């Protein structure tokens, strides 16, 4: 187990459903011996003899710009074109629709409060679930 940082514990790039890259800021530091996540992976790469070419967060973001440059343009929605080409590629394989009806996994407010590991560890979300199940 490699203890990592949570989203309040690291300056960290997350991209929402519309493509807007955004960064968190460090509010508190990680508890105990837990570390920032890419710091852990970079330390592992140095132990393994395959050391990655970044040392600071800015150098990770330079690599992140090299892989796709919209991940470091924060509070910017980059428009994505080429729906016609993706549509032409989607007409190649004729996948069959199943007869099962479209059922979302969250039907009521009961299924809302616990989705990830932070919400499942929350006593407040547990009181919300217990309050809506009664």
């Amino acid at each position: 187990i490699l203890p990592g940082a949570a989203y309040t514990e690291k300056s960290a790039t997350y991209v929402n459903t519309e493509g807007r890259a955004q960064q968190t800021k460090v509010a508190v530091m990680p508890p105990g011996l837990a570390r920032e996540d890419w710091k852990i992976i970079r330390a592992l790469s140095e132990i393994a003899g395959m050391t990655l070419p970044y040392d600071t967060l800015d150098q990770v973001r330079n690599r992140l710009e090299e892989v796709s440059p919209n991940l470091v343009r924060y509070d910017d929605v980059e428009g994505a074109n080429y729906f016609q080409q993706a549509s032409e590629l989607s007409k190649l394989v004729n996948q069959q629709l199943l007869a099962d009806p479209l059922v979302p996994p969250q039907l009521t407010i009961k299924d809302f409060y616990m989705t990830d590991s932070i919400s499942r560890a929350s006593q407040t979300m547990a009181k919300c679930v217990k309050a809506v199940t009664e």
């Binding site: 300056s11 800021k25 460090v26 530091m29 600071t56 924060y74 509070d75």
Partner: protein, 126 residues
């Protein structure tokens, strides 16, 4: 003549007495502070602020107090414009990131829309 021409970039880092660890490893954040959503007042969103990245706060073994080793942990600077803050950060060798001012966009308010004939914007109570 009594004036010289210095075309160099303005850099005072060797004069400020700041140790090097708190120049080249700090990230200044230049931003208009967000409105406290507990309150409708907007007078705290008028000026630009420069803060730094929060460093480690740990528990004092004797009292449980929040101990820090960051000298810049309470340093918040106030600027009238974004460009003054950028010039002050570049002058001091601080690597910075700038968030743009987020103004609330103008809303279309009509009290008569509470009582429309055929629109969904009727209030069910008042």
């Amino acid at each position: 003549t009594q004036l010289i021409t210095v075309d160099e970039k303005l850099d005072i880092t060797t004069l400020t007495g700041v140790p090097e660890e708190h120049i080249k490893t700090r990230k200044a954040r230049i931003f208009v502070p967000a409105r406290n959503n507990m309150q409708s007042g907007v007078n705290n969103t008028k000026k630009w602020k420069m803060e730094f990245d929060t460093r480690e706060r740990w528990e004092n073994p004797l009292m449980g107090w929040a101990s820090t080793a960051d000298p810049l942990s309470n340093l918040v600077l106030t600027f009238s414009t974004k460009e003054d803050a950028i010039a002050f950060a570049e002058k001091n060798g601080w690597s910075y990131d700038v968030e743009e001012r987020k103004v609330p966009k103008p809303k279309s308010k009509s009290y008569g829309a509470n009582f429309s004939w055929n629109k969904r914007t009727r209030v069910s109570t008042k």
